[PDB]
């Protein structure tokens, strides 16, 4: 989904809120902000109601100015309790009359997802890829910066997981493919105007393709 | 044109979620506050400390931190949420590497703790990708022009930690005194552990 969240290389944003080594508080500034991770883990593991896919994806699915305004750990209440309306667990109703007011949630989904794909390669360490030219409406883990362009693969997993394109949107069909360390030059992403070497994007099989 | 929705205040809101799925026999009894511990007390970055100052002082060791990232810190007992597939990236005289999550957050909790709101910023997860040199000397740490600085995003389940270089005055340490300089930002790969004068 080519969505606000999709943020690398965008330019504007000024200096990182940090100098190396500050004071960085402690883990929760306030007490509510372990409910967010919590709750998505009880509903992973506990209710099994969704994945932790789906979560990323619900996030993804805020409204674009309400992404932009909106705080890290209150994005994740706002998702987790959009899922949970979803799947039929709790009513937007009662959240709001619980809240004492508006509890507005993420947008409904534009996509229903897709499989696995069905035919993939195998790839082996030093192999040129390519990030295959495809445009996703629903999750997927592919930054657009990489779309279409070409690096060398610097290490295979040794493990499988579901192909996030489907999982994220609760699908049965969702597979299990290995990712794949893809080195780009920088200039590959960002022509001359980019300051870096290289970026490595851990990608899943089935976004690649062998390069030409 | 363009206004925020009304909203609740966010305590009220997180909590109220809490309560419609507590209410309903849906959360274990100390279930969030089992997790609110282990988030503040067990994931830590003083891990991936305890890491990078064996693997400085031990070359077995850092080969298989280096080749079986999971491994290794399977043998420490601090694989965990987060932190199931872990792959170590080795800075060198000509290469500095630096982890960000641009899509969201994405970190190696168990070994780095929990990400801070820095990492998590827009200005991060849009800027070090295309420009970290600059992101970098930003934050206080200059990278000189002969360094490739090479920048992992996290965008599946690989979680990553750095191993820095290890500075030079540190001869002789004691695995604590390493792991003193170890910094939550050494592990992110923002800094250089520093040596006191
Ligand atoms: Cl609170
Ligand atoms: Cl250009
Ligand atoms: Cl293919
Ligand atoms: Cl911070
Ligand atoms: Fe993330
Ligand atoms: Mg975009
Ligand atoms: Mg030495």
Redesign the interface.
Same mark, same amino acid.
Request: proline letters at 8%; one cysteine or more; glycine letters at 10%.
């Given at each position: 989904m080519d969505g606000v969240h999709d943020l690398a290389g965008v330019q504007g944003f000024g200096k990182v809120p940090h100098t190396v080594n500050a004071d960085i508080g402690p883990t929760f500034h306030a007490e509510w902000e372990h409910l967010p991770y919590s709750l998505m883990f009880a509903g992973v593991a506990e209710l099994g109601a969704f994945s932790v896919d789906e979560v990323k994806y619900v996030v993804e699915r805020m409204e674009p100015r309400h992404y932009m305004m909106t705080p890290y750990y209150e994005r994740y209440v706002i998702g987790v309790a959009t899922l949970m309306v979803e799947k039929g667990i709790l009513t937007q109703d009662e959240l709001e009359s619980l809240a004492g007011g508006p509890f507005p949630l993420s947008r409904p989904s534009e996509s229903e997802g897709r499989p696995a794909p069905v035919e993939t390669t195998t790839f082996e360490v030093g192999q040129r890829v390519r990030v295959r030219d495809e445009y996703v409406p629903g999750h997927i883990r592919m930054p657009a910066y990489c779309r279409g362009r070409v690096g060398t693969i610097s290490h295979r997993t040794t493990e499988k997981w579901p192909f996030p394109d489907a999982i994220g949107h609760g699908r049965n069909d969702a597979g299990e493919e290995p990712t794949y360390h893809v080195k780009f030059a920088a200039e590959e992403l960002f022509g001359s105007d980019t300051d870096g070497g290289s970026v490595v994007v851990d990608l899943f099989e089935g976004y690649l393709e062998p390069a030409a | 044109e363009?206004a925020?929705?009304?909203?609740?205040?966010?305590? $009220?809101?997180?909590?109220?979620? &809490?309560?419609?799925?507590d209410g309903?026999g849906? +959360?274990?009894d100390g279930? *969030?506050e089992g997790?609110?511990k282990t &988030? #503040?007390e067990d994931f830590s970055p003083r891990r991936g400390a305890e890491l990078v100052a064996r693997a400085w002082t031990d070359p077995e060791f850092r080969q298989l931190l280096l080749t079986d990232g999971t491994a290794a810190v399977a043998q420490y007992g601090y694989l965990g949420?987060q932190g199931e597939?872990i792959?170590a990236v080795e800075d060198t005289p000509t290469?500095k590497n630096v982890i960000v999550c641009?899509?969201?957050?994405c970190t190696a909790w168990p070994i780095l703790?929990?990400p801070?709101?820095?990492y998590?910023? &827009? #200005?991060?997860?849009?800027? +070090?990708?295309? =420009?970290?040199?600059? *992101?970098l000397s =930003?934050?206080?740490?200059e990278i000189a022009s002969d360094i #490739?600085?090479? +920048?992992? $995003?996290?965008?599946? #389940?690989?979680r990553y930690m750095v191993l820095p270089q290890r500075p030079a005055g540190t001869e002789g340490w004691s695995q604590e005194q390493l792991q003193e300089i170890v910094?939550? $930002?050494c592990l992110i790969g923002?800094?250089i552990p520093?040596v006191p004068t």
């Amino acid at each position: 989904m080519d969505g606000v969240h999709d943020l690398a290389g965008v330019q504007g944003f000024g200096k990182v809120p940090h100098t190396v080594n500050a004071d960085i508080g402690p883990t929760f500034h306030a007490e509510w902000e372990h409910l967010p991770y919590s709750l998505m883990f009880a509903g992973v593991a506990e209710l099994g109601a969704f994945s932790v896919d789906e979560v990323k994806y619900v996030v993804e699915r805020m409204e674009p100015r309400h992404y932009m305004m909106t705080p890290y750990y209150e994005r994740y209440v706002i998702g987790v309790a959009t899922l949970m309306v979803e799947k039929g667990i709790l009513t937007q109703d009662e959240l709001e009359s619980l809240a004492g007011g508006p509890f507005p949630l993420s947008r409904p989904s534009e996509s229903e997802g897709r499989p696995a794909p069905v035919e993939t390669t195998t790839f082996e360490v030093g192999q040129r890829v390519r990030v295959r030219d495809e445009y996703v409406p629903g999750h997927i883990r592919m930054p657009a910066y990489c779309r279409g362009r070409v690096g060398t693969i610097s290490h295979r997993t040794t493990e499988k997981w579901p192909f996030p394109d489907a999982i994220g949107h609760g699908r049965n069909d969702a597979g299990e493919e290995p990712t794949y360390h893809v080195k780009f030059a920088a200039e590959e992403l960002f022509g001359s105007d980019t300051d870096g070497g290289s970026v490595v994007v851990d990608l899943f099989e089935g976004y690649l393709e062998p390069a030409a | 044109e363009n206004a925020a929705p009304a909203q609740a205040p966010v305590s $009220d809101r997180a909590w109220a979620l &809490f309560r419609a799925l507590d209410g309903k026999g849906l +959360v274990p009894d100390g279930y *969030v506050e089992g997790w609110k511990k282990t &988030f #503040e007390e067990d994931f830590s970055p003083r891990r991936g400390a305890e890491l990078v100052a064996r693997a400085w002082t031990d070359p077995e060791f850092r080969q298989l931190l280096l080749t079986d990232g999971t491994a290794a810190v399977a043998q420490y007992g601090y694989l965990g949420p987060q932190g199931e597939y872990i792959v170590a990236v080795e800075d060198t005289p000509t290469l500095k590497n630096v982890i960000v999550c641009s899509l969201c957050s994405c970190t190696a909790w168990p070994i780095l703790g929990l990400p801070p709101t820095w990492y998590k910023s &827009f #200005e991060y997860r849009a800027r +070090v990708v295309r =420009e970290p040199r600059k *992101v970098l000397s =930003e934050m206080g740490t200059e990278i000189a022009s002969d360094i #490739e600085i090479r +920048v992992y $995003d996290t965008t599946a #389940e690989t979680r990553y930690m750095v191993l820095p270089q290890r500075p030079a005055g540190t001869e002789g340490w004691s695995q604590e005194q390493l792991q003193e300089i170890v910094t939550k $930002d050494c592990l992110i790969g923002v800094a250089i552990p520093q040596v006191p004068t």
